[PDB]
Amino acid sequence: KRGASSYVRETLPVLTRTVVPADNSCLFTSVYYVVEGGVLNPACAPEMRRLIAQIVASDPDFYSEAILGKTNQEYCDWIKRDDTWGGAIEISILSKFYQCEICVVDTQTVRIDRFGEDAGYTKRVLLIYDGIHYDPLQRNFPDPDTPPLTIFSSNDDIVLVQALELADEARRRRQ
Amino acid sequence: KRGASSYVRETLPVLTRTVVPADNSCLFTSVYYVVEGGVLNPACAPEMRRLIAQIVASDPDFYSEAILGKTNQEYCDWIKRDDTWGGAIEISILSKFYQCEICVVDTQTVRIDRFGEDAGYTKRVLLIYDGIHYDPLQRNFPDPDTPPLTIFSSNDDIVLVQALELADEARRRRQ
């Protein structure tokens, strides 16, 4: 029969995805979810786009065509549209605003893209990206009381270890 | 446009499954794969079953009905059949024989079952189990030269962190 006495069971916290709506707002909704401590607000994008436009218009010395791929005013008009999709340029701006490292695991390349890698921020948050859609990641614990965590120490590299595994498994399921 | 300059890419080694045949030999084939350094030998089971029977018959003081769920002779006849499936009793015996901790991640319970947890072995190997089929796990590296690794230090808990993630993702895909 079974053998239940011949081993010691172990468990640890794991990272899990929380799914946000599959629309062009997903970057903004995912970022809000993790910097807010794990709370979905599907209406956050217009305020976040306005914030990004304010930041970019206020620093044209930095935010030029070479960075934005559009003129500074053209970019600001563009980010304020309700139909545009966010990406790396906006994640970099939001990382600086929130003063938080944003680590995006990419399931197409099995790599983490770290925004704020050298900034000395004390916290990091994680998203997962498949080339079109972003979702937020959180740490779930193996106990019934601890709520999920979305904001990590920037010295916590366990989350990076686990995120990469999740990306690798996703890319293998895709293949 | 794209934003490729605004982040630092990072990667790390990840654990991956190597698939062994979907038949009743899978425990034995998976164990051979990892203790042999990552080599599939689909013909290993008869020799491994004979070894287990020899070990059990040689220590009836320990290997009684309370451990085996059969009489010692009934167990030895049973393990030598070519149609029987291995499980925890056999993993515990093989862990002692190989002097290696065998860590089975269970995708039904999202837990690692550690055989040899307190034995002071200096190496560990990992399998993944879904309630019926075992496959071996290995560490693959993000470079073209390092071959995959199946035998870890028993102080390497990164492999446990990553295995649990893989189990969690498997149980969520099942649901």
Author numbering:
A (entry chain A), B (entry chain A): 135 to 309
From the paper:
Sixteen ovarian tumor (OTU) family deubiquitinases (DUBs) exist in humans, and most members regulate cell-signaling cascades. Biochemical analysis and five crystal structures of OTU DUBs with or without Ub substrates reveal four mechanisms of linkage specificity. Mechanistic and structural studies of three closely related, unstudied OTUs with distinct cleavage profiles revealed four mechanisms for achieving linkage specificity, namely (1) the use of additional Ub-binding domains (UBDs), (2) specific recognition of a ubiquitinated sequence, (3) the use of a conserved S1’ Ub-binding site on the OTU domain itself, and (4) the use of an S2 site enabling DUBs to bind longer chains in a linkage-specific manner. We selected three members of the OTUD family for additional investigation: the unstudied Lys63-specific OTUD1, the cdc48/p97 interactor OTUD2 that cleaves atypical linkages (Lys11, Lys27, Lys29, and Lys33), and OTUD3, another unstudied DUB with activity against Lys6- and Lys11-linked diUb.
To understand the specificity of OTUD domains at the molecular level, we determined high-resolution crystal structures of OTUD1 (aa 287–437, 2.1 Å), OTUD2 (aa 132–314, 1.5 Å), and OTUD3 (aa 52–209, 1.55 Å). The catalytic domains are structurally similar to each other and to OTUD5 (Huang et al., 2012) and S. cerevisiae Otu1 (yOtu1) (Messick et al., 2008), root-mean-square deviations (rmsds) being from 0.6–1.0 Å. Catalytic triads are in competent conformations, as observed for pOTUD5 in complex with a Ub suicide probe (Huang et al., 2012). In OTUD1, OTUD2, and OTUD3, the corresponding secondary structure elements are present with or without Ub bound, and there are no large-scale conformational changes in OTUD2 upon Ub binding. Full-length OTUD2 cleaved Lys11-, Lys27-, Lys29-, and Lys33-linked diUb. Removal of the N-terminal UBX-like domain did not affect OTUD2 specificity, but deletion of the C-terminal ZnF domain or point mutations in zinc-binding residues significantly reduced activity toward Lys27-, Lys29-, and Lys33-linked diUb without affecting Lys11 activity. Hence, the ZnF domain in OTUD2 enabled a Lys11-specific catalytic core domain to cleave three additional linkage types. Along with these loops, the N-terminal helix in the OTUD1 and OTUD3 catalytic domain and the structurally equivalent C-terminal helix of the OTUD2 catalytic domain form the putative S1’ site that binds the proximal Ub. S. cerevisiae encode only two OTU DUBs, yOtu1 and yOtu2. yOtu1 and D. melanogaster (dm) Otu1 are orthologs of human OTUD2 (38% and 53% identical in OTU domain, respectively), and OTUD2 and yOtu1 both bind cdc48/p97 and are involved in endoplasmic-reticulum-associated protein degradation (Ernst et al., 2009; Rumpf and Jentsch, 2006).
